[PDB]
Amino acid sequence: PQITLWKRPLVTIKIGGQLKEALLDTGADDTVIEEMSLPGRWKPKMIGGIGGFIKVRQYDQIIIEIAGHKAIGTVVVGPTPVNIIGRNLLTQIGATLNF
Amino acid sequence: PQITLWKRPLVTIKIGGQLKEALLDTGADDTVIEEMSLPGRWKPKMIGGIGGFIKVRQYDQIIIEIAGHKAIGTVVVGPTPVNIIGRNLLTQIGATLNF
Numbered sequence: 001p002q003i004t005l006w007k008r009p010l011v012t013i014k015i016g017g018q019l020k021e022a023l024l025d026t027g028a029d030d031t032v033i034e035e036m037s038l039p040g041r042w043k044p045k046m047i048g049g050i051g052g053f054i055k056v057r058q059y060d061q062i063i064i065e066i067a068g069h070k071a072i073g074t075v076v077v078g079p080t081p082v083n084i085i086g087r088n089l090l091t092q093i094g095a096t097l098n099f
Numbered sequence: 100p101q102i103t104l105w106k107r108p109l110v111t112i113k114i115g116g117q118l119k120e121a122l123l124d125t126g127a128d129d130t131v132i133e134e135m136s137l138p139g140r141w142k143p144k145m146i147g148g149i150g151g152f153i154k155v156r157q158y159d160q161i162i163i164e165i166a167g168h169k170a171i172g173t174v175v176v177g178p179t180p181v182n183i184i185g186r187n188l189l190t191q192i193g194a195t196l197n198f
């Protein structure tokens with residue numbers, strides 16, 4: 001699809017068996033999801049943005065279905081205000097910015 | 100152009116006659132620029148990001164070139180880690196997300 005940007009580019013994702021709404025975010029290096037359980041090992045990390053840093057749990061090799069497209073990569077979990085699909089997974093679904 | 104997302108989508112902007120680097124950010128509602136001087140009056144605004152909120156100075160109808168494309172709109176100034184071009188100006192330059 002071609003998504004215009006008059007409004008937030010929100011899509012449905014499936015992660016860890018759960019459907020969630022997430023923002024397609026070219027400004028995010030990493031994919032950041034609100035608190036949930038995910039399987040496997042994790043390690044703590046800090047990520048920073050406007051307003052400062054939050055502590056997250058980093059899970060590797062997580063599969064997410066993004067608007068019907070599967071992708072695998074690292075997902076960090078923590079007290080983000082919005083679920084964010086960052087560049088590490090946007091690349092995997094072939095997303096580009098065009099103008 | 101068509102911008103892939105393997106690297107941060109950084110572009111050159113021109114604002115007040117000065118060139119700056121900025122991130123094309125579909126996850127940003129608003130365009131947020133590091134401290135600089137802009138003409139006219141400003142209004143207060145709070146923006147909420149990943150680590151909480153910040154106060155910014157909102158300037159309207161600012162002339163800004165983005166990757167060679169002319170925009171005139173709202174720019175807010177404050178302590179952002181990087182200059183971000185948000186959807187308010189991405190729409191003016193005709194940007195879409197495509198996959």
Ligand SMILES: CC(C)CN(C[C@@H](O)[C@H](Cc1ccccc1)NC(=O)O[C@H]1CO[C@H]2OCC[C@H]21)S(=O)(=O)c1ccc(N)cc1
Binds near residue numbers: 086122126130
């Ligand atoms: C500021 C950017 C360099 C990075 N951010 C992604 C960005 O798109 C966030 C993504 C975002 C979106 C909503 C809430 C929090 C974070 N947007 C944002 O802060 O936008 C602010 C300016 O416009 C306003 O509209 C949206 C919030 C305001 S970030 O959320 O801080 C971020 C930082 C590091 C990682 N790894 C992943 C995400």
Ligand SMILES: [Cl-]
Binds near residue numbers: 072088089
């Ligand atoms: Cl990854």
Ligand SMILES: [Cl-]
Binds near residue numbers: 094103
């Ligand atoms: Cl590619």
Ligand code: NA
Binds near residue numbers: 041060061062
């Ligand atoms: Na893992």
